[PDB]
Amino acid sequence: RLAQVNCPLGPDVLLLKSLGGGEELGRLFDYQLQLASSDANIDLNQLLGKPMGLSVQLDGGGQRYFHGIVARCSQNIDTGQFASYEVTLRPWLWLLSRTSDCRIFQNLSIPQIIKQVFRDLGFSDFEDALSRPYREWEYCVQYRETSFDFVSRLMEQEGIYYFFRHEKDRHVVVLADAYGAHSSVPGYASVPYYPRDEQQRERDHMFDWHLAQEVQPGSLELNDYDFQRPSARIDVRSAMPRPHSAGDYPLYDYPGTYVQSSDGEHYAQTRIEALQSLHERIELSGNARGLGVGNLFSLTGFSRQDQNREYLIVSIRYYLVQESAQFESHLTCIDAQQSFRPLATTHKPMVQGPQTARVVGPAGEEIWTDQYGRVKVHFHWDRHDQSNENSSCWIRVSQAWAGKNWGSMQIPRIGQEVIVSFLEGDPDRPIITGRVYNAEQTVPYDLPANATQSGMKSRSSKGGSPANFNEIRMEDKKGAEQLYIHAERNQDIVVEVNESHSVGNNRNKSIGHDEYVTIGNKRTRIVQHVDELRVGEKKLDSVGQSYVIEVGERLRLVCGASILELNASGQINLCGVNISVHASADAQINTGGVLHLNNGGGPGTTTEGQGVQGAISAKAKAPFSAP
Amino acid sequence: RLAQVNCPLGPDVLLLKSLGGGEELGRLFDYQLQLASSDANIDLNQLLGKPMGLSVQLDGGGQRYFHGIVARCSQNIDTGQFASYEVTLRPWLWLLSRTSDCRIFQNLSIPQIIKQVFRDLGFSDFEDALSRPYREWEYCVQYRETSFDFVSRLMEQEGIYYFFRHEKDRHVVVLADAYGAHSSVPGYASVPYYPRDEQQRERDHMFDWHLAQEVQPGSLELNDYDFQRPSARIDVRSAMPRPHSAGDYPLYDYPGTYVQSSDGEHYAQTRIEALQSLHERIELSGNARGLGVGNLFSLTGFSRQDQNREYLIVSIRYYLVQESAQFESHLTCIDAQQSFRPLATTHKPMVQGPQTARVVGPAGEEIWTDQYGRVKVHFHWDRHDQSNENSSCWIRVSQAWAGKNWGSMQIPRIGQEVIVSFLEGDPDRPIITGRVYNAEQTVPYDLPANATQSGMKSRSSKGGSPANFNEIRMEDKKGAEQLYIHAERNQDIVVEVNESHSVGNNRNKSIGHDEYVTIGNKRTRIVQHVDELRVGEKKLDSVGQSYVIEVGERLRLVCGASILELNASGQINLCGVNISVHASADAQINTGGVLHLNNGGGPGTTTEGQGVQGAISAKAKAPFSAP
Amino acid sequence: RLAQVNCPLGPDVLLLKSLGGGEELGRLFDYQLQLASSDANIDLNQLLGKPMGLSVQLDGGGQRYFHGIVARCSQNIDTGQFASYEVTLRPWLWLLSRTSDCRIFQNLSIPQIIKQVFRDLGFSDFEDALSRPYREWEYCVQYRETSFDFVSRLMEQEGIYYFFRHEKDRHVVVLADAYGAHSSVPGYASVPYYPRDEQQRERDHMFDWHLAQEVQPGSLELNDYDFQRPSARIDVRSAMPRPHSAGDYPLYDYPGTYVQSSDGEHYAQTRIEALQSLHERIELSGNARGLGVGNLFSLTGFSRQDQNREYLIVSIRYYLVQESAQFESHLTCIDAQQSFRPLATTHKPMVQGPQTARVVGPAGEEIWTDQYGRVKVHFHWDRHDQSNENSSCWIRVSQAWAGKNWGSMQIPRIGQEVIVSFLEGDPDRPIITGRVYNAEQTVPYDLPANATQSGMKSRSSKGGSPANFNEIRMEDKKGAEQLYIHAERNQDIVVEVNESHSVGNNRNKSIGHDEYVTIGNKRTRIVQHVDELRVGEKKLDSVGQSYVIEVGERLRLVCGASILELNASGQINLCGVNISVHASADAQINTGGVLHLNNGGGPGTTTEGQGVQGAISAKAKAPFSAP
């Protein structure tokens, strides 16, 4: 006879007064029940959220069901036996609009991602009709979004849609991506057309019809960059130009998240097919009780024979009114030979600016990175992942300069905070555009005083203490402008050609051990005034030819009391305490004057206290006394 | 009897034909008057924007008022005595949607911020019922927003709402945040229910009713980062789970502007309570002339005894039609035991990308910064603040590298332009992600020529001239690849272990004064071919043991004419002009040949012009002649 | 008599049943035809997109046309001879909403830009009534936008609008920016008012009227920055305060893309005039068949004599119903003395985050930049431009530090990838906030091993090999902390005052050729233990005064067998193989002991194998043997 409700209160406690609402592929059904019951004092908290459905009799003894979730409950003034309620049914999938989070999914295909969302909320009542092997996303992010909003966006990108199968006590999100996911309802594989201007016909019929068509873009071209293939023409274009005029206007868009071109192809195909799904649609209305969204059904008895086609019900509106039945539906078909595809209804979240984030890596490591300088990151909004190498995509790091091998490298280390930023705000395409200090990652130089101290500083990777650092700090405090270069072990330097140094005043070089200097040709050292050398022991001058000492006033050789002296006045003192000249052959003396011996005119040696080892070692050790 | 208008034209000049519109908590009232007057030639500029109100008689001789601001004026075809006008009333607070600016508010609580907005526009007609001590925001920004849009967002974040008190000639924005701000209207503390199916009842009654309920999220969890507490679990969760099924679906969101966790708690509480305010609401309609938005009123005579409750009028629609009255209202209550809280209706402005901004600080300073390297900033859009240390929050600066103390520091100085950027686009959370040159902050190296000159440069902080700089510029112009390091005073260098230098050709080191070199063990200098030393005065070799000179061909000591010479052929010349050998004890000569004296075979001294002081000082001074 | 369709099927094949729709300045007309034809089997692909129009008879034998583009086609149930169709007409300009791209326009005025968009799509049917000489935008970007959406935004910024001229077979987008672009339709230069309460009047008349007015902001002030004029008060304010109260509330907004202040003036003027266009508008309805959007027409016979004015039809709705006529229009005028100006209806695209982009320049160059360090860029989404110096605005580059001349420079070179970012997301205001490596622009140091290697590296500009680089790499691998400085030619160094070096152990300095050292005063070298010098040839000590050698244990001069020795024990050996002392005057010996000769107590020379040239040259050459 008529419709009866299937509900936890017992089908007899509630009986439908009317029905409203509708359905659409990839969009939540929405059914405004209106019903009456003998109790005005029904606790709506018992109804609300709970599963409720309808039994609608079909001819041939079939039944149709409209199971769903009570998202709104309401009651309205009516006679006491017939207290009126206006429950809205929604799918369990609608409850995913009642929850939000931020969560990262990695190395998962979107069918696997969605089923994680469903299964974590206990929503088991889903089913798979998908036919493509979908891409395994390296990294997906739910961000500032509901679980339904995220879910819908992912399907819309891949061009998945969903439609529902309704049982007595279950309603099932069937995931669908092809004609083959659709089915023809028994006995409604054809629906006749018979107008309301006929006498009221015995079966179910489409009573009204309105074909509609629209100009829709004939092609889409998509590009994305790939830093691993920056030369590669990732550009891919999909085309379904229509026969009609203006059927060829092309669209173009930039970053389809795809990176492999053969994935982007289908992102284009779906984005066009969704608009091609608008190029033709067919309104109908009628009594097709058996038919539902995503069902198929041939048309019969239509006058325009182009319309005697198999149709895909993209959307339905339903009406029932009932006595204690009149059934009506209003619906939009498309030609089943054109694949449906959902629009980008589900507006993506975009991060309208940068993020901060801890850098992370394996528990014992200090840096975790790859051949492009990417890093793993823990976002401060991520609740779910353990702040380790699994907590992000490999994220590229910007560098102050970067070229073909060459350029500046400043690899951010584990625990360092970074300024992330997304390739369009797209949470799925992070990139790092800065590093930043914080009360943990403290500043090198205490800044309210040392604000003038610029320059880099390091800290040895593995277990580096604050004292194990290279540095090139640079203070330009007026009256204290200091360069300070530090190597915590060694400072190699190479120059292919010429060094220079130019120092207005002083230099102190301390070599706490040993210096080698190897000169390939020449040295030339020049002093305006004074040199000193001091040596606590020995000096050797392996001069392979000539050593010429060109003194101007006094050479004074010394060793203790033994003293050779050359005055520029030509007086020589060779005087000592014992002497033993020797020659294997001749020896001589000559004078233009008169050599004589023991004259007593030379009274003594020219000892001046120089060369006394005690002082000389002391003067050579003088820099190296203990602190 | 009926309603009369209160207006500057005189209450008798305008008389109401009808009324429309409604009210809602935290949202502007909106009242479509329709009225008639004997003048069709009313200058609407006189009406428009001006304060106008209604007097509505209440039983017991009371009056109700609907004072407001004429936001729209209109006239429409009618009989001459009854020229018809369709004035819309809006609040004075609505005029804040007619003004926009950008302005920064700092160290102010949102109640103080709003009253600044009101008081600056002269809108004195506001009032305070707030009960919480609100957080003192360190920094708030009106940006790309109206004064109403900004105002509403701030209240919605704190979970403030407002409702109006209407006088004859004033209407007052009452700020409200608790049940206690509401009041019970005299004589309408209860309203009976009596249906239209009763005979027309003598008092004021609710004639219709529709309870409604919705599934709403049972909890919200909020996180924000804090660079001053980056380890701290700022995470805070608020929960109000419902008894019904699906009453526990949790929400999560990231950055609530809060930083202190106990502030974020109430941001969650309000965001849930606003949705809990949707979990139950009660439509009514009836003649409750006395009741208005934010009033309280018990219900009586309802059948379902759960409904005999105190109710909070969250919203009202009003109708009057009049003769020269029929009053109707349609309204939504909530149960007064549940706190109202406004939704996030007021979409926040987000800066969809970075900003430029001058750096600023105290008038005599050059850098103004804190222990984390934050700075004050003058935004180019800020009109109101004097480009000093008060013109911003302490803004963190990104650095090319940053770690635990260690890392690169590049503190931006006063007058320098920076690339700002916001933690989500949120103007209240700026951060700096770059520095940039401009025609004032000119580039170091004139770039159309010197594009190859890389590297840092400095300029002494206090009063540094362009010549007072450290530098490490780095040109890789092919055929001119130059390192250039400069210290405007001193270049300290340390190496914990080993230096190296490796120079393919030349080195020039000039020490314009004095060099000390202190070697803790050994030196070893080696020359393939030639050394020279020149000294304008003195050299000292304090060799504490042995000095051995190992010559291979000719030692030639000299001082003027005095010359000692050692040839490797074993010939020695010790010849001078005067000589005086001396010994305290013996002396000797020996020959295997035959010593004899004045042979005349040695004809002369070996003078070669070496050691003549005039040349030697000159050759040592030769580098140091005047330019 | 009535209306007949002008269509490719022949005006007799289709005849109008009714008409709907309307028009608005700067907005696309939209006309829901309803028509009937003897064929239900009309291929809609023939109708769709094609040009179709109406002929409407005007009195005095005139005709009105409504040519347009069939954007939607539809058919609906009707009698066979009268199969009903519901074609929607849209402008050809509407097809620009059916195409999208990203394209950059440079050094073009917006009138030139738009005509490029039109002319590239073949849409010739546009016309120019513009009166201002518009600014020549340096750089405009279509991004994530349709060609209509982009087009509309550009006109709305300049405050251009458009209206249509309709022919039989053409409809023309007239670009308009002043009253003078409007025209008065013959015979409708005045339209009488005569109410429906009159007997049906013989001519065309406005049958109804509703004046409306609104509070609208009295002024707008605009600012933008200019890095070429960062001191300049680019601030410009436009004002049109109304006489009424609240007629002076000012708006302020930041970045009007203008840079020259006199351009920004008109951006304000238009943004206010558009809102001033809302301050007054006049609804009408009536039979003004001749009048259309953007037409002018005086009013006559109105009672309120303020309304007997010239009016500008800002918008129209049309209705026809027809027999085989009743014409109706509903319209909004403004007073023609107030310039119309379109609202910011067309929401701008904003880049909600950064972009990557290749750097580019002239084909033979390596760097292309200007006196501010700007660069040209090829965006990865740009399809149209050849990746050269024409492919972008001069884009500023952020630098890690930047000041008055001084600061760090890191000029990104041709082929380098950069992180772009926009001044608000505004695609017309790009800026670069980072550089990034990629599989082409490879990282300097192979990072999975060398992650510890920090520091800059270069690569000679013109044809630099990987070996032609300056470097300052900095490894802090624990137990290997290395500084490494490299100049591919020369390393100049200056210090204004003092150097220091402090090396815990070793130093090796190799000078592969020649070292000069020039000391302006003093040197002081001190060795705890040992020095060596080795020289393959010669050493010279031009000591202009005294050389004093202060030995402590043994001076041992040598040249082959010739040996002078000074022991600190006072024993001297002066012994050789031949000797020839000589003096121009006296010579002496003296002893306190007893000189005697050939005693045989000195048995031999003190030869020790030192000074043998073969060894000595070898020991000086020892560092320089072949590898």
Numbering used by the authors:
A (entry chain A), B (entry chain C), C (entry chain B): 5 to 328, 338 to 640
Tell me, in the authors' exact words, what the paper reports.
The rhsA operon contains genes encoding its cognate VgrG spike and Eag chaperone proteins, both of which are required for the delivery of this effector into susceptible competitors.
To investigate how RhsA is mounted onto VgrG1 we set out to determine the structure of the secretion competent pre-firing complex (PFC) comprising VgrG1 in complex with full-length RhsA and EagR1. Instead, we applied C3 symmetry during processing to determine the three-dimensional structure of P. protegens VgrG1. In applying this symmetry operator, the RhsA and EagR1 components of the complex, which do not adopt this symmetry, are averaged out during image processing. The cryo-EM map of VgrG1 reached a resolution of 3.3 Å and allowed us to build almost the complete atomic model of the protein comprising residues 8–643. As expected, given its high sequence homology, the structure of VgrG1 from P. protegens is nearly identical (71% sequence identity, 81% sequence similarity) to our previously determined VgrG1 structure from P. aeruginosa (r.m.s.d of 1.035 between 544 pruned Cα atoms; r.m.s.d of 1.428 across the complete structure, S9B and S9C Fig) even though their respective effectors, RhsA and Tse6, bear no sequence or structural similarity to one another beyond their N-terminal prePAAR and PAAR domains. Intriguingly, we identified two spherical densities in the center of the β-sheet prism of the VgrG1 trimer.
